[PDB]
Amino acid sequence: PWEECFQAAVQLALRAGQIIRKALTDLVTETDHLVEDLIISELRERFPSHRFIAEEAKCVLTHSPTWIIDPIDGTCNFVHRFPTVAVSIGFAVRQELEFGVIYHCTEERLYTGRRGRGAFCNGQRLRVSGETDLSKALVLTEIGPKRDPATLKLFLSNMERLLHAKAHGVRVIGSSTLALCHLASGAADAYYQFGLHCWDLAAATVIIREAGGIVIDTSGGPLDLMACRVVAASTREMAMLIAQALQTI
Amino acid sequence: PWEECFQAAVQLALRAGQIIRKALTSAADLVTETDHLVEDLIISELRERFPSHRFIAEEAAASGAKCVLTHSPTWIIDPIDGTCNFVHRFPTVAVSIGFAVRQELEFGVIYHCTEERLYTGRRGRGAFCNGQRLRVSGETDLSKALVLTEIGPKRDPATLKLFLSNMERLLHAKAHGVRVIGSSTLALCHLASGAADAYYQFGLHCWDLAAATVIIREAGGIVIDTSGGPLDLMACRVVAASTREMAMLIAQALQTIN
């Protein structure tokens, strides 16, 4: 539940970070297998008692020390060579998130956060924007990798309401973890999405909160990992305003 | 005309890239300052070195309506593309300098400020990025298509419901993905590099697509009008794919303002 395993996450984040980096050079998904295997394998060895949740009834979090990982977030980008793919390694214990280590492979940024001990990216300490005016917010969001008839109106409509509140703008970059990190750094003021598995927000959650940001459920309430839905923002006013326009549908 | 001018294009994209990159370290106060500095820094030097050249920029168009490309040597400029990103320190802003002659796009030069990516294109001389020669993906199935689009700066049921409908139409086809990064120039350089397959937008100033057009073309891709016909700088709209099929498949999806 601390340091010894946190430094384990950083290097592993780095090793995998190095593995897909020179590999990013339609199923190169073997890279997914090489980086996960390599990470879950070295962590299972060094910490046998620990549990593991990751893109293997899914995000059932116990109270025992567990690891939530995403071998390579931004796989659709990776395919097309579109520079935005990360590695997420989140760590829980007592059924709460302890720390997070996201890694931007291309641009080489090591976003990391730890419960109580602040958030950081390659040295510089992170701190969210603090925006509260929806009309000044840069909102990031993703689209379910799953494409079926009506799971659409939740994208086009959500985007619709949010878009009229006078959002200064809207992004979609093909990577929830990285989008979440833009939130922690301050480059964005909010994020929302339906359909992101927990291994995408476990790491990013400790990071954002350790930078002053908040992470709740799409419905104004608290974050629920088993939900596959989240709404994080710079401030509470912002966050609530987001869950507002947001349609639980 | 072409050598002295192109190298001038580079020097300035760069210098400006430089003065902007530093700036990314308050309100929308400073962006406007930088936009004016960069703009005045770029324009005043070219007008001095080439006192006969014409300009298609944001700060000329004061003439009401604009983007009228004559036959004389003209510079299409965008001192800062991605100013909203600039405001929020979202790492995606560019400087763009296009050059036309005989009413044709001669060379493009777009600089990715933060990522230090310097894109250039020259009629018949190939497209590049930091030395690396560029080439489009050549993907042809809208189902494996990574598509890019941007929403204009304006917000009104008009230009809004349109964006959504087009988005809907594009998602209606099995488009493998959609990206919106807050930069049409950079969105376009990705199409030219192979990192994306298509792009489309209604309401984009012509200075945001002059340089970018030479580049996508010189890389192997095609840039056409939203209706599927020939590109029209006066239309403020576009479709750009890696293949003519991809291109028509996009225009096929969307239609126009009404």
Residue of A nearest to B158 (CA): A164
Report the candidate in B77, B180, B101 with the shortest Cα–Cα distance to residue A138.
B180
Q: Is B201 annotated as a binding residue?
A: yes
> How, if at all, do strands B74-81 and B54-56 pair?
parallel
| Radius of gyration of the CA atoms of chain A, in A | 17
How is domain A1-126 classified at the CATH fold level?
Fructose-1,6-Bisphosphatase; Chain A, domain 1 (3.30.540)
Q: Do A172 and B180 touch (CB under 8 A)?
A: yes
Residue A189: list chain B partners with CB under 8 A: 88
Return the exposure string of A155-171: e unless at least 16 CB atoms fall within 10 Å of the residue's CB, then b.
Answer: beebbbebbebebbbbb
Where are chain A's structural domains?
A: 1-126, 127-249
Q: Which CATH number fits domain B135-258: 3.40.640.10, 3.40.190.80, 3.20.130.10, 2.60.120.10?
A: 3.40.190.80
Interface of A with B (CB under 8 A): 26, 76-77, 79-83, 107, 129, 138, 143, 147, 152, 155-156, 159-160, 163-164, 166, 168-174, 182, 185-189
Residue A148: list chain B partners with CB under 8 A: none
Active site residue A200: yes
B61: burial class by Cβ within 10 Å (0-12, 13-18, 19+)? middle
> DSSP secondary structure string, A62-95?
-SS-EEEEEEEE-HHHHHHT-S--EEEEEEEETT
How is domain B1-134 classified at the CATH fold level?
Fructose-1,6-Bisphosphatase; Chain A, domain 1 (3.30.540)
Whether A184 contacts A128, CB under 8 Å? yes
Q: How far is CA A124 from CA A203, A231, B64, in A?
A: 18, 25, 46
Q: Do B137 and A172 touch (CB under 8 A)?
A: no
Q: What is the dihedral of CA A175, A171, A132, A154, to 10 degrees?
A: -80
For chain B, how many residues are written?
Answer: 258
Q: Do B167 and A173 touch (CB under 8 A)?
A: no
- Which positions of B are catalytic? 58, 78, 80-81, 83, 208
How is domain A127-249 classified at the CATH fold level?
D-Maltodextrin-Binding Protein; domain 2 (3.40.190)
**Rounded distance, CA A231 to CA A242, Å?**
7
Whether B212 contacts B189, CB under 8 Å? yes
Q: What are phi and psi of A66, to 5 degrees?
A: -125, 155
Active site residue A55: yes
> What residues have CB less than 8 Å from B167, skipping those under 6 apart?
A156, A159, B149, B178
B123: burial class by Cβ within 10 Å (0-12, 13-18, 19+)? middle
Report the candidate in A67, A52, A20, A73 with the shortest Cα–Cα distance to residue A193.
A73
Please give the single-letter amino acid code of residue A1.
P
CA A55 to chain centre: 13
Whether B127 contacts B117, CB under 8 Å? no
What are the strands of the beta sheet with A86-93, ordered from one edge? A51-54, A66-73, A86-93, A96-104, A109-114, A119-121, A124-125
Q: How far is CA B5 from CA A180, B108, B209, in A?
A: 42, 11, 19
Q: Is B208 annotated as a binding residue?
A: yes
Q: How far is CA B175 from CA A146, B168, B250, in A?
A: 11, 11, 10
Interface of B with A (CB under 8 A): 84-85, 87-91, 115, 137, 144, 146, 151, 155, 160, 164, 167-168, 171, 174, 176-182, 190, 193-197
User: Which helix (H) or strand (E) covers residue B38, if one does?
Assistant: helix B29-49
> DSSP secondary structure string, B118-184?
EEEEETTS-EEETTEEP-------TTS-EEEE---S--SHHHHHHHHHHHHHHHHTT-SEEEB-S-H
User: Which helix (H) or strand (E) covers residue B105, if one does?
Assistant: strand B104-112
- Cα of first residue to Cα of last residue in chain B, in angstroms, is 41
> Count of alpha carbons within 13 Å of A76, Cβ hemisphere only?
22
